[PDB]
UniProtKB/Swiss-Prot annotation:
It comes from the Viruses. It comes from Coxsackievirus A16 (strain G-10). It catalyses: Selective cleavage of Tyr-|-Gly bond in the picornavirus polyprotein. Zn(2+) 1 binds at C50, C52, C110, H112. Cysteine protease that cleaves viral polyprotein and specific host proteins. It is responsible for the autocatalytic cleavage between the P1 and P2 regions, which is the first cleavage occurring in the polyprotein. Also cleaves the host translation initiation factor EIF4G1, in order to shut down the capped cellular mRNA translation. Inhibits the host nucleus-cytoplasm protein and RNA trafficking by cleaving host members of the nuclear pores. Counteracts stress granule formation probably by antagonizing its assembly or promoting its dissassembly. Transmembrane segments: none annotated. The active site is at H15 (for protease 2a activity), D33 (for protease 2a activity), C104 (for protease 2a activity). Homodimer. This is Protease 2A.
Length: 140
């Protein structure tokens, strides 16, 4: 589990969104596994606006932050799960790192700010949903 709190927005994995997130919905995209809801309090995270392909992510199943090299956002095939059928997920970046269930929502960050959140795992790989192109998270 986990979320990004920027401005008056809460960014979560669409597959882990709560009823309150759906009742206060700003934007959602199943092809990216992302959902954004509105918040009453202001958040403290800042979004990275950069081209970093190295950073650090939080792994809840290890209580640890790991440094990783990750691929550029791309269209990647993700196996059928209990949340989605087999499909291509867009704006997904892969790295070598542990990831198991408990773990979407952990933040990936660089020196510029938050890059994205854990969205896929298994096989000694970890995948992250990029948020750096969502410029509107910085306004309103
Ligand atoms: C993420 S850990 C898990 C490890 C065992 C193998 C499967 C791994 O699950 C995933 O990759 N998922 C499940 C939740 C939805 C994700 C998505 N964004 O489509 C895909
Ligand atoms: Zn950066």
């Amino acid at each position: 589990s986990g979320a990004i709190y920027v401005g008056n927005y809460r960014v979560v994995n669409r597959h882990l969104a709560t009823h309150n997130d759906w009742a206060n919905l700003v934007w959602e995209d199943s092809s990216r596994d992302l959902l954004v809801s509105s918040t009453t309090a202001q958040g403290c995270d800042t979004i990275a606006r950069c081209d970093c392909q190295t950073g650090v992510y939080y792994c809840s199943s290890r209580r640890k932050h790991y440094p990783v090299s990750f691929s550029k956002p791309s269209l990647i095939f993700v196996e059928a799960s209990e949340y989605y059928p087999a499909r291509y997920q867009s704006h997904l970046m892969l790295a070598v790192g542990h990831s198991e269930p408990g773990d979407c929502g952990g933040i990936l960050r660089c020196q510029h700010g938050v890059v994205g959140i854990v969205s896929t795992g298994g096989n000694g790989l970890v995948g992250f949903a990029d948020v750096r192109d969502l410029l509107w998270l910085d306004e309103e």
